[PDB]
Design a protein around this nucleic acid. Structure first.
Ligand code: ADP
Lengths: 415, 105, 80
DNA sequence: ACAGGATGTATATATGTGACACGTGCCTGGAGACTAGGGAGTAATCCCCTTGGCGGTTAAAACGCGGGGGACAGCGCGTACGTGCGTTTAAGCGGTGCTAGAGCTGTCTACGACCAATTGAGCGGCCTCGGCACCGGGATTCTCCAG
DNA sequence: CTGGAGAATCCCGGTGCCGAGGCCGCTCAATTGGTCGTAGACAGCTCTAGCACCGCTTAAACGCACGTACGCGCTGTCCCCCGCGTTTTAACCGCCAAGGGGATTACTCCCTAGTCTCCAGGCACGTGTCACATATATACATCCTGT
């Protein structure tokens, strides 16, 4: 019923609502207004899909809450799967097991995919009989269209003796390695037998990132990325030769790289040492086209008393493109609230919509989006069906906001 | 059901024998109307040492090719009835309808 | 539950003997069990339908008689 | 060797069936107002059972084993059935060309249907006690070596 | 091909157990007597098939000839059911609480359904065309012939 993923803060966003010529619609695919910044997002998405001019940075500026993250989520959705879209917060680089610069270059590598094609042959049928003559034997597999015998060699007999697989089990046998996998006991876990041919060649493609390759080629069974046991790979010894070997895979017909996308949220958390590394990491061939956002203006840079836009030094500020987002009006706010209500199961009245739009233009946009569900549930408390203005007023009274909670501080608390 | 291994070996032997029947492979009628004996002349008193008995090559080192019995293509499968290999489901059907526990070729 | 084995080998052997058989194969019992199970399932489904229609909780013998009559197996001795 | 007529032949055009879609009229549904009777809906009776856990005891299964005698395949071989073929038999595809004989319409009774009586089957409730069902032999009669 | 056993039947007479039969006593359901609309039967009338041909065409049934392939018998031997004796086990008990679960009967009552109207619209029937099949001009198109 309820999956691990539920209705979050960016579920309505299904992608960029652009036309064939990168012209944003008034409201489409869950994106309201934001024409200029949305079309700029479209341009960057197109030049990413192109994947020729690498090493480009963009900064989505604007007032707090002006869909700066919505644009990034829409770009991610439009880019679709099969293309790495790495999203991390500016605070995630501050790690104790690895240095901030190492974490940053690690995220960079994670934001670059490598496309490799395989031509393995996979078997898929059901076991009829398994034999063992203490050693050699025979194996009879069955599918809905045919049955056949198989000579159980050393590897096969050993693997099938180690595994508990027996007669009457739909299984798969990768003739390359011999990995046995049972998808269900029998006819009705139980599951029916497969159809078509028993042994058939299957093409497999893996979009492994340079990070995965490095972790695979660093230690004995070095695939410890699952828990990031590694504190940092050996730069220029196991990290530069992997690049040369990937270039060898390319321009030969072995593999092709897939330019990913990086989205560092709240970049103002990055210190001066992280910005210094970006000034040179974005000048290499294998560098993704990253985007970033910051709600602060000319604030202090973490590390010194210097004041600079976005809290980012000038040396990096003159190295990226800024994308400012304008404030929303009544129309845009109301349409965003309506799309948010459509995402959920709530259905507000027209007067309720106007009241919520006024409340969201008074204090802030996110406050109305939050009060949506509160009023929806308060309506269900009085045994109603539609969220009326009275419910929104009751909620506005119950739940306070930033600006109204700050003004209520006429009683001194701790400090 | 399933056939035994004696039947398959007899089929193989009889097919190899037909592969050397030169007069007429299926129906040697073609009209009925110093007379030495057959190969029995020496096959009845097979000698030892260098001779057609010891002159045999023997089993090869290269494993047998798994080739289909119907179309002559690679056959990763093997029919349960007589062991005759087949390539695809179409091959298995064309076999079962032409060769099975009831028929040989 | 799985009490279909209640119809044991000697029971099937006697049923066959009554039918003129004097020699039975080994694989006959598992087939006779399935055939009898299907025949039952059908007759009992018909009888349970007849019973549910009558708003009764007990499957009367006349309901079984009617269920058999539907399958053409008219059984005399129980009411019709 | 050629220039033109004398035959073919697919090609394109106007004419034959069928089957769907349309268009009238006349029966069959629909609509409505009464009048039971049927069935729903509790409320009582009589069954005769109800379940868990567990101890006991006897035969019906359940199992072991030998082994025999059948279930299978191979061999062979001799009909015998399909495979062409030349013949000829008779279906059948259109016709003509009557007449039974469906199918109908009308008319008008005997023939059902209630129906309120009347009452004698027939149905249940007991009682009784021959008649099957089982014991106990005692012959007989198959089955199985065993010669 | 008998013996020679050896179980299995199976006569045949015996004896209580309990279903089969009978008798009694009411209840109900078939009979009686009489009235009342239909059912359908029967007497026409129509016209649709059904039958009966006949001819021309030719598919087809058919006989024959002629192998090959399949059928039947034979054989060998080799697995897997039969016969029968032992251990296992489930199927009968019996036990020991204390009461209901559910077909069965019955009585109001009341919605639902028959009956019986009058209509009018929707579905059998007649007619209008249009898609596929058919048969025929025709503009070249390939041998034949003067030349
Ligand atoms: N174009 C848009 N379409 C739909 N919803 C939007 C759009 N822009 C902003 N929003 C909504 O407004 C909210 C703004 O918050 P957010 O963009 O997350 O702030 P920030 O970008 O500063 O972190 C989001 O929760 C989002 O649902």
């Amino acid at each position: 019923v309820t999956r691990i993923e539920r209705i979050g803060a960016h579920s309505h966003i299904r992608g960029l609502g652009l036309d064939d010529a990168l012209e944003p619609r008034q409201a489409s695919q869950g994106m309201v207004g934001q024409l200029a910044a949305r079309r700029a997002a479209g341009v960057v998405l197109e030049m990413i899909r192109e994947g020729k001019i690498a090493g480009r940075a963009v900064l989505i500026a604007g007032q707090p809450g002006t869909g700066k993250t919505a644009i990034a989520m829409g770009m991610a959705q439009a880019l679709g799967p099969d293309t790495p879209f790495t999203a991390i917060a500016g605070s995630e680089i501050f790690s104790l097991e690895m240095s901030k610069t190492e974490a940053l270059t690690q995220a960079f590598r994670r934001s670059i995919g490598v496309r490799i094609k395989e031509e393995t042959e996979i078997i898929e049928g059901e076991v009829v009989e398994i034999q063992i003559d203490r050693k050699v034997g025979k194996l009879t597999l069955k599918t809905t269209e045919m049955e056949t015998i198989y000579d159980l060699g050393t590897k096969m007999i050993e693997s099938l003796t180690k595994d508990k697989v027996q007669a009457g089990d739909v299984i798969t046998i990768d003739k390359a390695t011999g990995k046995i996998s049972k998808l269900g006991r029998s006819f009705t876990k139980f599951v029916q037998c497969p159809d078509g041919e028993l042994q058939k060649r299957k093409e497999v493609v893996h979009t492994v990132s340079l990070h995965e390759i490095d972790v695979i080629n660093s230690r004995t069974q070095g695939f410890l990325a699952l828990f990031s046991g590694d504190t940092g790979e050996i730069k220029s010894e196991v990290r530069e030769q992997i690049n040369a070997k990937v270039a060898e895979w390319r321009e030969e017909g072995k593999a092709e790289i897939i330019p990913g996308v990086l989205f560092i949220d709240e970049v103002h958390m990055l210190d001066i040492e992280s910005f210094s590394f970006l000034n040179r990491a974005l000048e290499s061939d294998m560098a993704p086209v990253l985007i970033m956002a910051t709600n602060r203006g000319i604030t202090r840079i973490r590390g010194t008393s210097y004041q600079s836009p976005h809290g980012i030094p000038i040396d990096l500020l003159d190295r990226l493109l800024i994308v400012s987002t304008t404030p929303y009006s009544e129309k845009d706010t109301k349409q965003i609230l309506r799309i948010r209500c459509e995402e959920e199961d709530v259905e507000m009245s027209e007067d309720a919509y106007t009241v919520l739009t006024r409340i969201g233009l008074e204090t802030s946009l996110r406050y109305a989006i939050q009060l949506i569900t509160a009023a929806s549930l308060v309506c269900r408390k009085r045994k109603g069906t539609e969220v009326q203005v009275d419910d929104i007023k009751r909620v506005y009274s119950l739940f306070l906001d930033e600006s109204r909670s700050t003004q209520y501080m006429k009683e001194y608390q701790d400090a | 059901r399933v056939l035994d291994r004696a039947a398959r070996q007899r089929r193989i032997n009889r097919q190899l024998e037909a592969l050397e029947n030169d007069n007429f492979q299926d129906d040697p009628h073609a009209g009925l109307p110093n007379f030495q004996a057959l190969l029995e002349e020496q096959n009845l008193s097979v000698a030892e040492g260098p001779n057609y008995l010891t002159a045999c090559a023997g089993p090869p080192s290269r494993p047998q090719r798994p080739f289909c019995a119907v179309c002559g293509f690679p056959s990763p499968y093997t029919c349960v009835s007589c062991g005759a290999r087949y390539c695809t489901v179409r091959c298995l059907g064309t076999h079962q309808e032409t060769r099975c526990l009831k028929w040989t070729v | 539950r799985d009490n279909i084995q209640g119809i044991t080998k000697p029971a099937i052997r006697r049923l066959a003997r009554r039918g003129g058989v004097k020699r039975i194969s080994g694989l006959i019992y598992e087939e006779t069990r399935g055939v009898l199970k299907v025949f039952l399932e059908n007759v009992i489904r018909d009888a349970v339908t007849y019973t549910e229609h009558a708003k009764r909780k007990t499957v009367t013998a006349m309901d079984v008689v009617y269920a058999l009559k539907r399958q053409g197996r008219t059984l005399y001795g129980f009411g019709g």
